[PDB]
Amino acid sequence: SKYKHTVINNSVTLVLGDAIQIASLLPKCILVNAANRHLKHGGGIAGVINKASGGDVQEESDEYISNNGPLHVGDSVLLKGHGLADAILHVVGPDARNNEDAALLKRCYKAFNKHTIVVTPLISAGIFSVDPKVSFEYLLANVTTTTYVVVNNEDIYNTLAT
Ligand SMILES: Nc1ncnc2c1ncn2[C@@H]1O[C@H](COP(=O)(O)OP(=O)(O)OC[C@H]2O[C@@H](O)[C@H](O)[C@@H]2O)[C@@H](O)[C@H]1O
């Protein structure tokens, strides 16, 4: 009720705000990180998640990548929450700058469905250069669990809420 939000369907609510703040409000949730294949948390939400954890997220991510090797595009990994959420689901969206197809967002978003409550940004819609409407369409087509899709730009919010 405190946020500009639009309930889209029985699964998805679009929220204008900061995904970290929304994840903190909910008593139980998974927070989704928009990651790269090496979980090297850069200039988008990944860096903000890492900084909010005091670097704990990057330390854990490095440990995982040593155990797994690099992820494939479209893969995800459930790691610890570090007080931000019950857990963080790191998803590797396609990077359009590297000619990776937006269709791989199907794999990213399907990974949400085993989790009861998900708080997510729009995967690939920032640095990875996929149209926010395209990412949101893949989200709506594939997500079948209670999901708060949090966007921090009001113009994007207005576009997607219409
Ligand atoms: N705190 C936030 N809350 C909600 N949405 C946010 C927030 N910060 C950024 N966003 C939005 O989330 C969307 C995803 O943007 P990025 O975080 O840039 O994600 P992506 O486009 O998937 O790029 C992934 C790449 O960026 C690096 O951070 C990461 O390490 C990877 O290399 C964009 O629309 C961006 O504006």
From Swiss-Prot:
Catalysed conversion reaction: Thiol-dependent hydrolysis of ester, thioester, amide, peptide and isopeptide bonds formed by the C-terminal Gly of ubiquitin (a 76-residue protein attached to proteins as an intracellular targeting signal)
Compartment(s): Host membrane; Host cytoplasm
Domain Macro as annotated: residue spans: 1-162
Membrane topology: Multi-pass membrane protein
Domain of life: Viruses
Main function: Responsible for the cleavages located at the N-terminus of the replicase polyprotein. In addition, PL-PRO possesses a deubiquitinating/deISGylating activity and processes both 'Lys-48'- and 'Lys-63'-linked polyubiquitin chains from cellular substrates. Participates together with nsp4 in the assembly of virally-induced cytoplasmic double-membrane vesicles necessary for viral replication. Antagonizes innate immune induction of type I interferon by blocking the phosphorylation, dimerization and subsequent nuclear translocation of host IRF3. Also prevents host NF-kappa-B signaling.
Protein name: Papain-like proteinase nsp3
Organism: Bat coronavirus HKU4
